[PDB]
Amino acid sequence: AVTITLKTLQQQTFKIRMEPDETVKVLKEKIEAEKGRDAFPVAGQKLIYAGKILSDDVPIRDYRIDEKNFVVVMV
Amino acid sequence: MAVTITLKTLQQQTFKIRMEPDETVKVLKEKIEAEKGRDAFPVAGQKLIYAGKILSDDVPIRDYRIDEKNFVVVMVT
Amino acid sequence: MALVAPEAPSEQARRVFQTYDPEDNGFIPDSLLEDVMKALDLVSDPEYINLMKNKLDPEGLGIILLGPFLQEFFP
Amino acid sequence: EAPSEQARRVFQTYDPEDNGFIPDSLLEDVMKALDLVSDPEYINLMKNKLDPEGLGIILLGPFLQEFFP
Q: Which regions form coiled coils (chain D) (predicted)?
């Protein structure tokens, strides 16, 4: 029951909820459902947390992302 | 904002040091030396451990997020 | 690989701990604390480890539980 | 030896400051260490039994009474 905060390179902010065990790949899928496959296709997504790139197969709980900071989604 | 840091030696003593969160580890060692003596706790021989990690002289003490109910271990080497 | 985001230290520690606990007891014998701290690059001076044994296992149960271990080393 | 005696010692290990209680986030840890059922829904139900007011803490007394009557 965790909430990720996402910023795009168009100064847009938004929130995605997922379970701790769901992977970065599923975060990308949820971003795509929320923002569209035209502009945020899963394949083209790079998720950047604290200046480094999140890895598709890793459960999100494993990064211990504080809800204070944000994840940047780049394409 | 002052933090009271409890120190424990590995030959079984305890004492406390008051200092400001922006002051560095180097200042903590200097306060330990003034408190316990240059003879037995010279600054250059002090090695300070918190959360199983060695504290670095140039680092503001706040970065280690020291809990007042915990303690820093002092090793003299 | 230089840009790959790293695991949170607490989650790496959880993984190590569970690995030393193949029966999922929730704890390790306190004789394994040294090995677990060395595997996690924590200070392993013998007398320091004996202070940590006593901080973590004040009741003298002879075991190190995961909760207290993470709380001391990876809060 | 009464299992309650070991339960007290395990509980005290999660409460090294002798508050007499633990954050309810550690109830799962304690129940696991004591070989008590730890299905997430069972944990949640017993949380509400032990902490009916929603303070977020588990007191030692009610803990021992629920699992070692």
A: none
Method: X-ray
Expressed in Å, this structure's resolution amounts to 1.9
Nearest CA in chain A to C15: A62
CB contact under 8 A, C51 and B75: no
Q: Residue C42, Cβ neighbours under 10 Å: how many?
A: 22
Rounded Cα distance between A24 and A75, Å, is 15
Mutate to test the interface with A, among C11, C12, C15 (most CBs of A within 10 A): C11
Alpha-helix runs per DSSP H in chain D:
3-14, 27-33, 40-50, 60-67
- Gap between the Cα atoms of C40 and C51, Å rounded: 18
| Domain covering A2-74 in this structure, CATH number | 3.10.20.90
Residue numbers in C near D33 (CB within 8 A): 25-27, 65
From chain C, pick out residues whose CB is under 8 angstroms from the CB of B65: 75
Q: Which chains touch C (3 or more CB pairs under 8 A)?
A: A, B, D
Residue in the block written with tokens 């999922």: C24
- Nearest-Cα distance to chain B for C66, in Å, is 15
Token pair 């569209």 in the structure block, residue: A36
Q: Where are the domains of chain D?
A: 3-67
Q: What is the DSSP code string of C36-58?
A: HHHHTT----HHHHHHHHHHH-T
Q: What share of chain A is helix, strand, coil (3-state, %, to 5)?
A: 25, 30, 45
Cα separation, D41 vs C18, whole angstroms:
23
* Closest C-alpha among C62, C61, C70, C8 to residue C32: C62
Structure tokens at D30: 């304690």
Are chains C and D in contact at 3+ CB pairs closer than 8 Å? Answer: yes
- Superfamily, domain D3-67: EF-hand (1.10.238.10)
Residues of C within 8 A of D17 (CB-CB) are: none
